[PDB]
Amino acid sequence: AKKVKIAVDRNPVETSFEKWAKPGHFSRTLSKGPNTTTWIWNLHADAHDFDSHTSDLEEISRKVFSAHFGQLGIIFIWLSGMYFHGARFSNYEAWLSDPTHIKPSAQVVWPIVGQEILNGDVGGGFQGIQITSGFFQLWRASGITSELQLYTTAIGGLVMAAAMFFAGWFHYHKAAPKLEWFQNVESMLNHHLGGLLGLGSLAWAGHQIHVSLPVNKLLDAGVDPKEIPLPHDLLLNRAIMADLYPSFAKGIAPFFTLNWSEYSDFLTFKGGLNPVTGGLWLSDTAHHHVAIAVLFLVAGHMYRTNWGIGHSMKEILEAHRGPFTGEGHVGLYEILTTSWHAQLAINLALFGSLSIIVAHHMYAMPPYPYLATDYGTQLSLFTHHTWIGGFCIVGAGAHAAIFMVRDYDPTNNYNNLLDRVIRHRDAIISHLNWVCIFLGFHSFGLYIHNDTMSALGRPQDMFSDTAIQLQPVFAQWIQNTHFLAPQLTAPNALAATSLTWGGDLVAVGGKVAMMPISLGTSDFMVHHIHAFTIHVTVLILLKGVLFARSSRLIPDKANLGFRFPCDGPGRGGTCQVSAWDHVFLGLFWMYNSLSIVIFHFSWKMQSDVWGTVTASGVSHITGGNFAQSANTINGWLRDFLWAQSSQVIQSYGSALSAYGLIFLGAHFVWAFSLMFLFSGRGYWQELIESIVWAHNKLKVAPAIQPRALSITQGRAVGVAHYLLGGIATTWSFFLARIISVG
Amino acid sequence: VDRSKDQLYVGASQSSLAYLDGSLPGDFGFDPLGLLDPVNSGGFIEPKWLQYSEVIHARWAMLGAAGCIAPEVLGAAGLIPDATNIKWFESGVIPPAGSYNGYWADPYTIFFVEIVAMQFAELRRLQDFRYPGSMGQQYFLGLEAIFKGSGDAAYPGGPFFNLFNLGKTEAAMKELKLKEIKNGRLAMLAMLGYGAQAVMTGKGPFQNLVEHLADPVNNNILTNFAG
Amino acid sequence: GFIGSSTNLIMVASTTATLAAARFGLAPTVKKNTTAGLKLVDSKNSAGVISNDPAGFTIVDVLAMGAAGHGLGVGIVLGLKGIGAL
Amino acid sequence: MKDFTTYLSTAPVIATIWFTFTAGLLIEINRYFPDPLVFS
């Protein structure tokens, strides 16, 4: 019964610049200094690999804890800059008056070498680069009405950034927690559930109830922003709040007397979108965060720390034991309290999956005012948070394999769930292998079937709505069920959560904010492409984790490590057998799969949702050509890539000309990467020998011997440039397109 | 926290009795979170700083508790002009709540003198905690004679801070320290009561007491939720 | 008058029931955890809280069952108003 | 201070200062002599 308590060590390390002048001090191998250029790359590659510098878990934990303070400090500088640039280099104040006609802008360029053309005409008597980060919509929702309020937040952001860097220094050099402190998982969950998420949600509800709701109620009514009461006047004067919301006339007595229905005027359950602004009701959002606050505060009292009551996480795991799974979850608690990589593997997996869920829910239920009708912001936010989720998931595979090689110990795992999974890995990979082949034929083969039938003049033989049909009947049933939910299954909800299920469109400023989305044959075909490309990415990453330690090819792969190039040309060739190489290959397939996801979103929205409302009806940007054209590969090439890339390639000579340059430059970086992917360092080391000879001939040969990159670094350099070039190409193409037409 | 006196308070636990041995003033065994455990202590969470901080909080709170109500009591008795019968939160500390015009200077001009005066008072007090006895060495207009401290940071003693050398005997001094801590702890709760009562009712501490005595049932925390 | 109303009586009854249940060995307490079979067994408390109560009822049991009683009472009060009973 | 000045002498720090200086000089020249195409 080890008590939960604060435990630190005093002055563990000395604050000196001595080691700043000795590169490689952290590692025994690199401490001797460079002899070849390979040393330089090894210095940066192993800088943050704490688990390999020392075998002491306590020393590893202390570095992780302070390295996290540095990450927090950097985010505050970044957040401070965004708020500062809104105050000093933005047209936010003008935007508040005319949100539907003025384009948000918060970056201004200097007039040098003729780059001032990038300062486009955005409105409000202002010239600058149009932003798609959605900060203006967020600030309006919170109630910010002046650049002074933006300026104060930026100054507070810098103070927080300074505090974060002090904390990192303090908790590493002055008072470093001990290992027993880091292993109170029960205590950490209690504080992070009820304290971080719980009180954070309650505190934000306080801001919305007292600041956001009154300010946005008057803004929607048409009051001039400068004439709205200041947030502190709303807080101090209950009389003002009573005018906007009569419930405030009764104070907090209804809360304590359980007459919670008194607060129905500002704690609503409307659902749908606010017709004036096209975003979610803030009164709905306040009741959401109040409900979420109670749920998490209750959640934070589940685990036992010092007073008997509560649950032991070890006891829960050991009780869940069945007939089909041997020992069961035994041994997981020790794994998850002694392996940072195991924790990172789980957290990256769910944190990445969460970022993808955010993308879907924010577009379908636009939570900020004037977010929906700003098509550039909708496209950018969905695409940004899908890419973030994709990279995190691939990392989850990377750090699951690191755990398998380094932190896995067979003695602690005998006949438990983890052990039994390893003992039928061939069954898992063989079945997942077949599923991917099945899904590739029956999804991408349909496109090839349609392309061939169309080229042969046999449209009646294609898979389409006017031909052989493939209707997503299951998805269509769910769309109808959610559309009728307020009638019978959610009686107290006035409207459906989203307008995608069905009903009538909401139009703000003559543009569609959201309308029902219909699923047809093309939607059926594209969705099963997603299932195909996701399943393949699982195959590559799961295969790397399950075969990290051994396989039928390399029986002792664990001893080779996690990151090695091969085991030589024997056995026919063993290139790229290490678990690191399964992340390397998995990155390509993740990029392949998410590219189709963001092409699907971009074409579907422009074709079927986005558009201009007029007397006759809705005219969409691409005029509803998704249904008939997206069932062939030729349709995507012609109607999507070729037609919509018109904006980016005609950008020269305008404020969008920067996107044209990056469109070409991205194409360049991508092709440049194939040099590293298609070649091997054997050629390049011999090339450097001849180059070194010329320098030797001129007495200008370096003391640090030039070396061609290692095998692994060639693959890492290749994939990094491949991803940057490919993703930046879509980024330029999307923004130049949507900003130009959207 | 058991009110009044007792050997141990409600929250006393067998774990806290390990290191709470009665040496400190007002040591009633109440430490449910175990912040005073000597083992593996560091930073500001250590016995010497936490005990020192409580006394400092006690002494500021005692001045605050008596000073946040005296203007109302003296004003109610007619001993000071009504122009200065002002609620503690309407003196100027929180201008949005209320400010008093009539000080010899603008409240920001007065604040700068407060900054300079407290910089000397507080940084010199700190240096005696970091380097005991160090403030009695460097020349300070001859005043260093009274800043030599006594080894215990919270109780400097000396010719000035112990002007009338009360508590000459060891037993007497312990009783005085206990009385100081209990009054100080009581004042710390009183100050929190002033702050909470100001928000809930918007009136001064003296007004709240008078109203409660008038109709105790109709005037209390429960009835003030709504008005 | 709030005192004596349906809302007040339910909250006092629900809060009293949990305290009565916990004190008389009908609900889990600080000194009695519950096994997987929903049976009370002795527990180990890191910060053994001294209590003069003959049954060892500590102040933590009060907070644990005060909140549990309030949760039960609040749900009943709001639930009845939902069906129209209250 | 000797060690700190040694840290500033490391290759990445020197390159940052050197290119920051080099870039600044080129930027400033084009600020006062915009659009140079021929020596003239």
Ligand code: CLA
């Ligand atoms: C001036 C204050 C100071 C000083 C003199 C030291 C000194 C020391 N620290 Mg400490 N430290 C400090 C502040 C300081 N620290 C702070 C603020 C933190 C919190 C983050 C830490 C956290 C910390 C940890 C966790 C560790 C040390 C360690 C060390 C030792 C070696 C550090 C080294 O080689 O740095 C040279 C390194 C750099 C100059 C890199 C700076 C990185 C920062 C975060 C900036 C990041 C910028 C970012 C990449 C920008 C984007 C880049 C993009 C634009 C290209 C040494 C005793 C190490 C040790 O004792 O090992 C045995 C160790 O593990 N320190």
Ligand code: CLA
């Ligand atoms: C964390 C979130 C949060 C916060 C901080 C607040 C804060 C506030 N709410 Mg709000 N509220 C919230 C959530 C929140 N609310 C939620 C979720 C709901 C929905 C149920 C409401 C519904 C609601 C209503 C209906 C009303 C408020 C009101 C208020 C105000 C007065 C409350 C009151 O009477 O307090 C009573 C007393 C206290 C809170 C105690 C104060 C303790 C002080 C700070 C101690 C200071 C001690 C210190 C030592 C003294 C200073 C010394 C120094 C100078 C030397 C206050 C600004 C009222 C108001 O005025 O609205 C305009 C009001 O009518 N709220």
Ligand code: CLA
């Ligand atoms: C919370 C996030 C997180 C954290 C804390 C870590 C932490 C760690 N990872 Mg993991 N990882 C993550 C996410 C994370 N990872 C994700 C999302 C992926 C998938 C891509 C991976 C994939 C991965 C691999 C494959 C490996 C690690 C490794 C490591 C370890 C050493 C890393 C190192 O030394 O980097 C040093 C940092 C660098 C050399 C800098 C990299 C710079 C990149 C390539 C720049 C890309 C472009 C840039 C962002 C934008 C343009 C720049 C401009 C100048 C042009 C360390 C424990 C390594 C290890 O050995 O672990 C045991 C290892 O082999 N990670």
Ligand code: CLA
């Ligand atoms: C367009 C390029 C392309 C194509 C077509 C494929 C195809 C395939 N890859 Mg590969 N891959 C590519 C690029 C490509 N890859 C690249 C660039 C990389 C490097 C990053 C990789 C890395 C990679 C890995 C690491 C893996 C794959 C896997 C797969 C397979 C997926 C499942 C499957 O069987 O689908 C079905 C097959 C197809 C869709 C191919 C086209 C089928 C046509 C349209 C129909 C059949 C034709 C018909 C019979 C008529 C023939 C007539 C003729 C005989 C006369 C498949 C063979 C995975 C695998 O093997 O899973 C089991 C796998 O693990 N690929």
Ligand code: CLA
């Ligand atoms: C991830 C965040 C984090 C975590 C987990 C810890 C953890 C720890 N810190 Mg560290 N610390 C952090 C951030 C963190 N710190 C930061 C950001 C700073 C810079 C400000 C510091 C500065 C710091 C110091 C100087 C010390 C510690 C100490 C400690 C230890 C005891 C903490 C304790 O009991 O606090 C309990 C909390 C309190 C006693 C203070 C409560 C009130 C604070 C000042 C404000 C809290 C604000 C709240 C979150 C939001 C209010 C909302 C609204 C009302 C305004 C423990 C190892 C101590 C130590 O080493 O002990 C051995 C120690 O001396 N920390």
Ligand code: CLA
């Ligand atoms: C922490 C302690 C504290 C603080 C910060 C304050 C702060 C305040 N009090 Mg309060 N007060 C306190 C404690 C405190 N009080 C206590 C304990 C009591 C009970 C005794 C009172 C009783 C009280 C009353 C009755 C009044 C205040 C008032 C005030 C306000 C005006 C202060 C002023 O004008 O001072 C004046 C400045 C001084 C007394 C210091 C003079 C400094 C010179 C340089 C000294 C020169 C000395 C000379 C050379 C030699 C000695 C001469 C001598 C022998 C004659 C201000 C908000 C007034 C108020 O609210 O007005 C609206 C008010 O009427 N307070």
Ligand SMILES: CC1=C(/C=C/C(C)=C/C=C/C(C)=C/C=C/C=C(C)/C=C/C=C(C)/C=C/C2=C(C)CCCC2(C)C)C(C)(C)CCC1
């Ligand atoms: C027998 C006896 C006695 C008596 C006692 C008594 C009479 C007691 C009482 C007690 C009590 C009377 C207690 C209470 C408590 C309470 C609490 C602790 C509460 C809590 C609450 C909460 C936590 C809440 C929450 C919430 C919110 C806020 C919102 C909504 C939701 C919920 C509900 C969750 C004496 C000692 C004298 C002596 C000996 C014997």
Ligand code: SF4
């Ligand atoms: S050296 Fe290159 S080609 Fe040869 S086995 Fe290793 S990775 Fe393959």
